[PDB]
Ligand binder design. Structure first.
Ligand SMILES: [Zn+2]
Ligand SMILES: [Zn+2]
Length: 47
């Protein structure tokens, strides 16, 4: 897991798209993450 910290206006889709990964793979690395309720400062895996 490469970590990334959620910033204002971030979405799981935009994070995935910017890194050239599928949103499904991103979800598989992020244990039931709630993509419609992200918190500023939340830490996610991007690899
Ligand atoms: Zn894949
Ligand atoms: Zn939700």
């Amino acid at each position: 897991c490469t970590t990334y910290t959620i910033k204002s206006g971030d979405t799981c889709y935009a994070i995935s798209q910017a890194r050239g990964i599928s949103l499904s793979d991103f979800e598989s690395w992020n244990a039931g993450i709630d993509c419609n309720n992200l918190q500023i400062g939340q830490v996610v895996c991007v690899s």
